[PDB]
Amino acid sequence: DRPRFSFSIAAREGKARTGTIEMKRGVIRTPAFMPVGTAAGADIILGNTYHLMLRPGAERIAKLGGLHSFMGWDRPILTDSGGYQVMSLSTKQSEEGVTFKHMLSPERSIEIQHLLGSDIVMAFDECTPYPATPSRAASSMERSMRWAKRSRDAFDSRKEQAENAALFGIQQGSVFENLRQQSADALAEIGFDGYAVGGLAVGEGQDEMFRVLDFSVPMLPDDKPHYLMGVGKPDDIVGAVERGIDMFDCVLPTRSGRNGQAFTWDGPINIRNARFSEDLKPLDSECHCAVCQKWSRAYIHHLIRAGEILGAMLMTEHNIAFYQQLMQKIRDSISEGRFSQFAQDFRARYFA
Amino acid sequence: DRPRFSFSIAAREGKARTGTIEMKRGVIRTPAFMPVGTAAGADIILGNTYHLMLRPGAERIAKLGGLHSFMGWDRPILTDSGGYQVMSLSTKQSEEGVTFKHMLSPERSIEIQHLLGSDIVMAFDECTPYPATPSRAASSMERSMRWAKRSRDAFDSRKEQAENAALFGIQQGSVFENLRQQSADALAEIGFDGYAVGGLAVGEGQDEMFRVLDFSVPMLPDDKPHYLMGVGKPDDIVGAVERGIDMFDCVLPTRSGRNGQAFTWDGPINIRNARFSEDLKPLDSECHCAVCQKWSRAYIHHLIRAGEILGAMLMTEHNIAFYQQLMQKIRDSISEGRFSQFAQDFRARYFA
Ligand SMILES: CNc1nc2c(CC[C@H]3O[C@@H](OC)[C@H](O)[C@@H]3OC)c3nc(N)[nH]c(=O)c3cc2[nH]1
Ligand SMILES: CNc1nc2c(CC[C@H]3O[C@@H](OC)[C@H](O)[C@@H]3OC)c3nc(N)[nH]c(=O)c3cc2[nH]1
Ligand SMILES: [Zn+2]
Ligand SMILES: [Zn+2]
């Protein structure tokens, strides 16, 4: 019988790691990509806390048997704490939490995630806007750390949650090394099952994001998983793995899939472009997905140009599969000690 | 090795028949429902002649290897002749054909269908508007019969087509028994592989459509398949089979699937309605489709209300599967001599 939570590192290359997270509902191979659950293989999917709390509401999801039953997915599910989305899509902040057009607090966030039944629960934090002054970044991070402790206590007070789920803390501090360190120290003192790097993929760009990861990831406990929230493009994922990240989520595969963009080893392509109208090659030359086994760029181009939902579905299936093949290649290369070479080869071809 | 075309009737009950059409690319079980090819089991699918001739053009489809290669479907394909769609969606009529914003003639229609590579080719006809006066219905039908002969000759002049495909003639005559008879006589004199009842499902309503079928279908050769163009709702299909129809096509399963409507044995439902928000039953209680095996009305309701493409896809998959289960039940009941009872039971429950 699998444990509630156990992370094991099987192999390393530089800062990169590959291994497994064992949970009651399944094993998660790392580095992992975690796709949106409602998108359409993956070891864990995402539940959309913000949407679900509004429609149909967390209490209603619980009445229906929880997210696993509702979505027909019996493996692990990760949920965010909801605040990022409230601040992005809705607001009034206070030490208690956020009110918006209801009150979302650390305690309420944890309870919502309990009612949804997720396996990996995120602490309720504040994703500091970018750019931020040192003072504002510090005040924001300090509040997030107080909220992390409140999240910890709320999670621990719910027996079913404490015994069956896992809780990740989220590091903040914007782009400032000293604040990232204080945040890491605060989170480690509280103690979490995993640690996320928050506050990135918010407009800073890849060079700056990588610079922040360079010093931020080593601050987190080495023996726990590291989750980079909101990342990202394939090249962002590769560089983040090079910097010690184990888990990823991004809206790109689905957003791109619904908007004519396909990921390939030769970079992204816009399938609507006329240059694909007579292209009999599959979306990607090496991809093993069902779409690439059967249909051409020309046919998918045709479907999308005709407004056929089948086209968007095939694009999305391909993009999700591409991301999973990327993660498999990353895991295999780290395990074989050839990840550095893989990263180099990947970049040379993707950006050719 | 299968013949070019062979229709065999295995069993009858009243005017209803069940059997098979054998063609080089496969066997078609009748009564048959023929779904849109780009929708997402079926023995034959439809190619959209009108759309294809505009985007990317029939010549381009031929360059890409024909529709079978293009769509990844190696079984039979049926194509319409294009005029119905031109008159519905675009016009100037003449004895030569129709010009619209190009000229579509019987000869050009047959050539387009040849370039697409379809297995069942429809004659180029005029679908008379409804209502029509006797004079206008007669003039229209007479032109369609001249065009049927031209279609026959064009098809026969193309070796690959004549030897590998089949040609159906289309009966016209509006709602008038004498014109339907003249049309049937003209088509039988020319000689076709199958016979369609055209000019219906154009606003006349079920009672009138059934009245016209009552006298029109017996006018067609008994030993050839009968295709009712544009029909229809499940109850229309059942009543048409009771009147001797063997083949069907309809935009309903896909249009409904993309617009929140699901077909069930208890009638259609609009899954967006709030009454489904907590309904844990599958879309239909008896349906064997993949969707009903796995997901609830509540989840599909959620997906569609959230604007998720997955929702529309699941609805469409279910509707297509429902239609195929309907046709299987029809075939089985005729073969077992219990179709009358099936039709009665079907109606009692569908309209309860
Ligand atoms: C895009 N960049 C980005 N996203 C971010 C998210 C949302 C991820 C969440 O976004 C949802 O997708 C819309 C996913 O559900 C995911 O949750 C698992 C963040 N969430 C929290 N709690 N804290 C952060 O610092 C944070 C930073 C982010 N940067
Ligand atoms: C809706 N009612 C209806 N449709 C009709 C169609 C289009 C079927 C065609 O419609 C396309 O779907 C948009 C399908 O491709 C199908 O072709 C196989 C007809 N086509 C011809 N040639 N002649 C007729 O008398 C006719 C009557 C119809 N009544
Ligand atoms: Zn693929
Ligand atoms: Zn079903």
Cβ within 8 Å of residue B255, ≥6 positions away: none
What are the CA-CA distances from residue B250 to residues A41, A137, A294, B36 (Å)? Answer: 36, 60, 26, 8
Cβ within 8 Å of residue B307, ≥6 positions away: none
| φ and ψ of B135, to 5 deg | -65, -45
Residue A177, H or E segment: helix A177-190
- CB burial of A77-96 (b: ≥16 within 10 Å; e: otherwise) equals bbbbbbbbbbeeeeeeeeee
Contacts of A64 in chain B (CB under 8 A): 278, 280, 296, 298
Q: Is A147 helix (H, G, I), strand (E, B) or coil?
A: helix
Residues with CB under 6 A from ligand 1: A 46, 48, 78, 80-81, 83-84, 122, 125, 127, 170, 198-199, 201-202, 229-230, 249, 251
Give the count of beta carbons closer than 10 Å to the beta carbon of residue A45: 20
Kind of pairing, strands B16-23 and B6-13?
antiparallel
Cβ within 8 Å of residue A204, ≥6 positions away: A130, A131, A175, A212
Superfamily designation of domain B1-352? Queuine tRNA-ribosyltransferase-like (3.20.20.105)
Locate A240 and state its tokens.
Answer: 């983040």
How far is the alpha carbon of A74 from chain B, nearest alpha carbon, in Å? 12
Q: Which of A202, A147, A143 is nearest to A175 (CA)?
A: A202
Please say whether the beta carbons of A167 and A197 come within 8 A.
no
Q: Is A313 in contact with B316 (Cβ distance < 8 A)?
A: no
Q: How many CA atoms lie within 13 A of A44 on its CB side?
A: 27
Residue A83, H or E segment: helix A83-89
Q: How far is the CA of A270 from the centre of ligand 3 (A)?
A: 14
Q: How far is CA B212 from the centre of its chain?
A: 18
Q: Is A196 helix (H, G, I), strand (E, B) or coil?
A: strand
How far is the alpha carbon of B55 from chain A, nearest alpha carbon, in Å? 8
Spell out the SS3 assignment of chain B: CCCCCEEEEEEEECCEEEEEEEECCEEEEECEECCECCCCCCCCEEECHHHHHHCCCHHHHHHCCCHHHHHCCCCCEEECCCHHHHHHHCCEECCCCEECCCEECHHHHHHHHHHHCCCEEECCCCCCCCCCCHHHHHHHHHHHHHHHHHHHHHHHCCHHHHHHCEEEEEECCCCCHHHHHHHHHHHHHHCCCEEEECCCCCCCCHHHHHHHHHHHHHHCCCCCCEEECCCCCHHHHHHHHCCCCCEECCCHHHHHHCCCEECCCCCCEECCCHHHCCCCCCCCCCCCCHHHHHCCHHHHHHHHHCCCHHHHHHHHHHHHHHHHHHHHHHHHHHHCCCHHHHHHHHHHHHCC
CA terminus-to-terminus distance, chain A: 47
- What is chain A's alpha carbon radius of gyration, rounded to the nearest angstrom? 20
Q: Which of B132, B291, B295 is nearest to B200 (CA)?
A: B132
Cβ within 8 Å of residue B188, ≥6 positions away: B220, B221
Q: Quick one: closest CA in A to B259, which residue?
A: A309
DSSP secondary structure letter of residue A57:
-
- What is chain B's alpha carbon radius of gyration, rounded to the nearest angstrom? 20
Cβ within 8 Å of residue A199, ≥6 positions away: A127, A128, A130, A171, A172, A173, A174
Please say whether the beta carbons of A206 and A214 come within 8 A.
no
Q: Which of A134, A84, A137 is nearest to A109 (CA)?
A: A84
Q: Which of B203, B245, B250 is nearest to B228 (CA)?
A: B245
- Spatial separation of the C-alpha atoms in residues B254 and B40, rounded to whole Å: 9
Residue type, A223: D
Angle between helices A177-190 and A134-156 (to 10 degrees): 10
Cβ within 8 Å of residue B158, ≥6 positions away: B110, B111, B114
Q: How far is CA B21 from the centre of its chain?
A: 15
Resolution of the coordinates in A? 1.3
| φ and ψ of A124, to 5 deg | -85, 115
- Spatial separation of the C-alpha atoms in residues A26 and A41, rounded to whole Å: 13
Which sign, positive or negative, has the C-alpha torsion B249, B250, B256, B258? Answer: positive
Q: Which of B38, B104, B24 is nearest to B70 (CA)?
A: B38
Please say whether the beta carbons of B202 and B229 come within 8 A.
no
Residues A309, A312, A314, A320: what is their CA dihedral angle, to the nearest 10 degrees? -140
Q: Is A62 helix (H, G, I), strand (E, B) or coil?
A: helix
- Spatial separation of the C-alpha atoms in residues A197 and A243, rounded to whole Å: 12
- Spatial separation of the C-alpha atoms in residues B89 and A257, rounded to whole Å: 29
Locate A188 and state its tokens.
Answer: 């480690």
Q: What residue has token string 């997906």?
A: B303
What are the CA-CA distances from residue A341 to residues A16, A242, A345, A350, B35 (Å)? Answer: 13, 11, 6, 14, 49
| φ and ψ of B213, to 5 deg | -60, -35
What are the CA-CA distances from residue B29 to residues A239, B33, B44, B76 (Å)? Answer: 56, 9, 9, 12
Q: Is A283 helix (H, G, I), strand (E, B) or coil?
A: coil
How far is the alpha carbon of B342 from chain A, nearest alpha carbon, in Å? 34
What residue ranges do the domains of chain A occupy?
Answer: 1-352
Q: Is B70 in contact with A258 (Cβ distance < 8 A)?
A: no
Q: Quick one: closest CA in B to A308, which residue?
A: B38
- Spatial separation of the C-alpha atoms in residues A292 and A301, rounded to whole Å: 13
Method used to determine the 3D structure: X-ray
At residue A257's C-alpha, the angle toward residues A255 and A263, to 5°, is: 105
Q: Is A244 helix (H, G, I), strand (E, B) or coil?
A: coil
Give the count of beta carbons closer than 10 Å to the beta carbon of residue B342: 19
Locate A307 and state its tokens.
Answer: 């407004």
DSSP secondary structure letter of residue A36:
B
Residues A307, A310, A313, A318: what is their CA dihedral angle, to the nearest 10 degrees? -110
Q: Which of B5, B80, B6 is nearest to B48 (CA)?
A: B80
Contacts of B56 in chain A (CB under 8 A): 277-278, 302
